[PDB]
Amino acid sequence: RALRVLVNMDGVLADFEGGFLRKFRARFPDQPFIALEDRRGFWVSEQYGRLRPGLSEKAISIWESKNFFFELEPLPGAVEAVKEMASLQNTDVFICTSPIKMFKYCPYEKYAWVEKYFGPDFLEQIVLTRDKTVVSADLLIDDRPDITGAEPTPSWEHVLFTACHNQHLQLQPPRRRLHSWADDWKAILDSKRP
Amino acid sequence: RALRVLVNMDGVLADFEGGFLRKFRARFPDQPFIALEDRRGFWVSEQYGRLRPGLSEKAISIWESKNFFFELEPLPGAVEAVKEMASLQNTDVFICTSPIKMFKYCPYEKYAWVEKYFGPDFLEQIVLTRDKTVVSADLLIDDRPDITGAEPTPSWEHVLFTACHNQHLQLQPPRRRLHSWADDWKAILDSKRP
Ligand SMILES: Cc1cn([C@H]2C=C[C@@H](COP(=O)(O)O)O2)c(=O)[nH]c1=O
Numbered sequence: 512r513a514l515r516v517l518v519n520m521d522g523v524l525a526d527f528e529g530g531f532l533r534k535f536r537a538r539f540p541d542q543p544f545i546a547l548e549d550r551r552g553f554w555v556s557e558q559y560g561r562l563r564p565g566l567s568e569k570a571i572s573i574w575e576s577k578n579f580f581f582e583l584e585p586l587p588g589a590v591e592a593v594k595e596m597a598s599l600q601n602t603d604v605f606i607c608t609s610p611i612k613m614f615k616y617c618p619y620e621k622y623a624w625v626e627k628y629f630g631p632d633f634l635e636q637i638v639l640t641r642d643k644t645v646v647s648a649d650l651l652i653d654d655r656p657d658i659t660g661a662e663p664t665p666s667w668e669h670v671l672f673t674a675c676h677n678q679h680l681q682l683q684p685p686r687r688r689l690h691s692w693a694d695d696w697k698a699i700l701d702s703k704r705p
Numbered sequence: 706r707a708l709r710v711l712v713n714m715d716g717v718l719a720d721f722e723g724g725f726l727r728k729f730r731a732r733f734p735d736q737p738f739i740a741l742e743d744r745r746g747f748w749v750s751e752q753y754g755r756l757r758p759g760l761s762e763k764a765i766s767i768w769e770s771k772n773f774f775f776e777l778e779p780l781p782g783a784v785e786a787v788k789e790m791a792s793l794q795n796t797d798v799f800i801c802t803s804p805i806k807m808f809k810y811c812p813y814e815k816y817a818w819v820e821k822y823f824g825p826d827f828l829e830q831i832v833l834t835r836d837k838t839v840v841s842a843d844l845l846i847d848d849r850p851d852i853t854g855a856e857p858t859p860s861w862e863h864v865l866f867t868a869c870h871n872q873h874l875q876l877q878p879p880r881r882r883l884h885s886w887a888d889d890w891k892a893i894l895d896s897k898r899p
């Protein structure tokens with residue numbers, strides 16, 4: 512009855528790519544790096560690892576470090592759009608995010624980030640999971656192309672949120688994109704309503 | 706195709722009631738307390754609050770304190786049963802747990818607890834959410850009687866795990882219980898398979 516929308520955090524709400532590149536360059540100023548226009552594929556670690564031996568591990572250490580997640584900047588229009596989306600009649604919004612393997616900071620910082628931008632009351636809307644296919648909803652807005660897990664037939668339609676790593680990707684019909692938060696997300700939502 | 710089972714953490718895997726009572730008594734030795742046989746209703750804070758003014762807040766401070774979640778003891782048979790359950794053919798097990806409002810320690814400690822008892826590889830099977838009805842599965846084993854949220858018709862059957870606070874409760878047919886991990890959980894699982 513209410514339309515349910517899952518909104519991914521990294522690469523959709525939070526600027527993981529920009530914050531990573533900045534911190535990587537400051538920490539490792541003598542290593543080569545991947546400019547955002549050159550990013551391809553979801554896994555930053557795999558691309559950096561192909562660039563040079565040992566770079567995978569150095570990339571991983573950036574997001575394993577304290578304050579990495581907390582200090583991510585919101586992507587343009589993300590906060591405003593999700594706030595309006597959640598205020599819409601017959602619309603329930605959840606933030607669906609995958610923590611990393613190292614769990615000392617990431618869970619905590621992700622809660623703190625959501626509190627900071629959306630307020631205490633929005634914390635109730637967070638789902639942390641490595642498997643999104645077991646979360647049921649009408650829509651999932653997420654920048655990762657390949658979303659898989661234990662449920663072979665997820666209830667949501669995956670709308671690919673555009674990011675540097677996926678912008679060149681040709682999708683198979685009928686898969687569809689949300690180009691940025693300036694794009695017409697209301698029309699995508701409305702297309703799933705009765 | 707695989708049977709999917711969500712197993713709650715507090716009151717099912719982890720002995721929240723016992724660990725709370727112990728820590729409450731050590732910290733507040735001059736307050737009255739609720740013996741486990743006298744516990745009624747899911748909310749410890751509400752019962753303690755009816756016992757005396759100010760006790761709700763003192764109860765809350767126990768589980769808000771560092772190491773509360775981490776130092777919970779496993780309930781008898783819980784670790785062994787979940788390990789066997791996850792090893793079964795055509796069976797995917799997730800640990801589904803609701804964090805508290807105060808998020809500095811609880812998320813982190815819950816990951817650490819699961820690592821401690823089930824190993825690093827089991828961390829992938831954790832879903833943190835305040836709303837279990839948006840997690841899809843065949844079964845949810847959970848000690849809280851009233852499980853509600855945004856999805857009015859959850860895909861799972863809720864099997865009530867017995868606890869001090871619910872043991873006297875008469876359920877409405879066809880709702881059903883798992884009495885403890887010594888009870889025949891395999892038969893409940895098998896009843897949901899093709
Ligand atoms: C790009 C990248 C990300 N991650 C972790 C860090 C944050 C989450 C982002 O996953 P998401 O919830 O946005 O699907 O995965 C990785 O573990 N490796 C990587 O290469």
Ligand SMILES: Cc1cn([C@H]2C=C[C@@H](COP(=O)(O)O)O2)c(=O)[nH]c1=O
Nearest residue numbers: 713715747748749750802803805849
């Ligand atoms: C008993 C009790 C528990 N909680 C929090 C602490 C741990 C989780 C347990 O929720 P569960 O995932 O077991 O449904 O809720 C509370 O916030 N208040 C209470 O009175």
Ligand SMILES: [Mg+2]
Nearest residue numbers: 519521522654
């Ligand atoms: Mg993402």
Ligand SMILES: [Mg+2]
Nearest residue numbers: 597598599602
């Ligand atoms: Mg709404």
Ligand SMILES: [Mg+2]
Nearest residue numbers: 713715716848
């Ligand atoms: Mg419980």
Ligand SMILES: [Mg+2]
Nearest residue numbers: 791792793796
């Ligand atoms: Mg199995």
